[PDB]
Structure formats: structure tokens, C-alpha cells
Amino acid sequence: TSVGLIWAQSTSGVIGRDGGIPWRLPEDLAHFKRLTMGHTVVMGRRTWDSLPAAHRPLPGRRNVVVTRQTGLVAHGAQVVGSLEQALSPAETWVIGGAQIYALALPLANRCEVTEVDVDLPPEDEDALAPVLDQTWAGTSGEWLVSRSGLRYRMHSYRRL
Numbered sequence: 476t477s478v479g480l481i482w483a484q485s486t487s488g489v490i491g492r493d494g495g496i497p498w499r500l501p502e503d504l505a506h507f508k509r510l511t512m513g514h515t516v517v518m519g520r521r522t523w524d525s526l527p528a529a530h531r532p533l534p535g536r537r538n539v540v541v542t543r544q545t546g547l548v549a550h551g552a553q554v555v556g557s558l559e560q561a562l563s564p565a566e567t568w569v570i571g572g573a574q575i576y577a578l579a580l581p582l583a584n585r586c587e588v589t590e591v592d593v594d595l596p597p598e599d600e601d602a603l604a605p606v607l608d609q610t611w612a613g614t615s616g617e618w619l620v621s622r623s624g625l626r627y628r629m630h631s632y633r634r635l
């Protein structure tokens with residue numbers, strides 16, 4: 476019933492580039508697994524096809540893919556034709572990408588953001604993070620240092 480968006484972004488707001496994610500941050504993958512394990516995860520079809528083969532479907536989670544197609548070549552998803560169909564019938568996580576974040580933003584009650592301090596000026600075809608309006612209240616964790624050297628931190632928003 477509760478609908479959460481979860482994403483990682485560069486400070487500049489990039490979430491996706493060239494059909495993938497333009498940084499590596501192991502600590503964020505662990506965070507993403509902890510928050511989503513045992514829950515339904517909803518994603519757009521491009522994100523489904525973007526998963527490396529070892530990670531598709533996401534293990535231990537019910538994988539729901541939003542698409543206008545009849546069905547998919549890549550196995551392991553339950554396909555739906557709309558976000559509403561994905562959401563009904565306690566925690567449903569929308570895990571990307573930009574198109575599916577835009578669809579889910581009006582419905583969500585939580586956002587869990589990882590900010591990665593990697594210098595990625597936006598390029599012409601990048602997917603960008605959604606912008607949160609005045610209906611959201613947020614708290615931010617401290618800056619952390621990855622074993623890879625990148626700084627990162629988590630922001631958590633709840634609908635007012």
C-alpha cells in the first residue's frame with residue numbers, strides 16, 4: 476500500500492547514461508538490497524533490459540515490469556501495462572528509471588535517495604533524477620567515504 480521511490484544520483488542529478496549507470500558504488504548496491512529485499516520492485520522496461528544478466532530478475536524480490544508490449548524476451552518478470560496495475564494488490568519500491576519515476580512520483584509516500592559525489596556534468600541523452608516539490612520533507616545522512624574513494628550520502632523523504 477505504501478509506495479517508495481529509490482534511486483541513486485550524481486550530485487548533478489544524473490541517474491542513467493548509455494543504457495546504464497555511469498558510476499560504481501558498492502555501498503549503494505548493498506543499501507538498495509537491504510531496503511528492497513523481500514518486497515515487490517517495480518521498474519520500467521528499459522531498466523529491466525539494462526540489468527546485467529546476473530542481476531535479472533533481482534533475487535529475493537517480486538520483479539514487476541511496466542511495459543506497453545505484450546511480453547518480454549528477457550525472463551523473470553511479471554509484466555503489467557500501467558503503474559496502477561503494478562501497485563494493486565506492505566512496501567512496494569519503484570526502482571527506476573526516469574520515466575517510471577515520473578509516473579510514480581504523484582503516488583509515492585517515500586523517497587530514498589543516494590547522492591554520489593562524482594563529477595558528471597549532464598550530457599544530451601542522460602536520464603535525470605526527478606525533482607521533489609513542496610509536498611516532501613527530508614532528512615540527510617552524513618557524508619560517507621566508499622572503499623572506492625567516492626563520497627556519498629543518503630537522503631530520505633516522506634510526504635508531508
Ligand SMILES: NC(=O)c1ccc[n+]([C@@H]2O[C@H](COP(=O)([O-])OP(=O)(O)OC[C@H]3O[C@@H](n4cnc5c(N)ncnc54)[C@H](OP(=O)(O)O)[C@@H]3O)[C@@H](O)[C@H]2O)c1
Binds near residue numbers: 496519558570574
Ligand atoms: N541510478 C539509478 O538509481 C537508476 C535506477 C534505475 C535505472 N537507472 C537508469 O535509468 C535508465 C533507464 O530509464 P528510462 O527512463 O530510460 O527508462 P525506464 O523508466 O526504465 O523504462 C521506460 C519504459 O517503460 C515503459 N513505460 C513508460 N511509461 C509507461 C506507461 N505509462 N505505461 C506503460 N509502459 C510505460 C515503456 O516500456 P516499453 O518500451 O517496453 O513499452 C518504456 O520504454 C538507464 O540508464 C538505467 O541504467 C538508474
Ligand SMILES: Nc1nc(N)c(OCCCOc2ccccc2CCC(=O)O)c(-c2ccc(C(F)(F)F)cc2)n1
Binds near residue numbers: 571
Ligand atoms: N539506490 C539505488 N536505487 C536504485 N533504484 C538502483 O537501481 C536499481 C536497478 C538497477 O539494479 C542493478 C543494476 C546493476 C547491477 C545490480 C543491480 C541490482 C542488484 C540487486 O539489487 O540484487 C540503484 C543501483 C545503482 C547502481 C547500480 C550499479 F551497480 F549499476 F552501479 C545498481 C543499482 N541504487
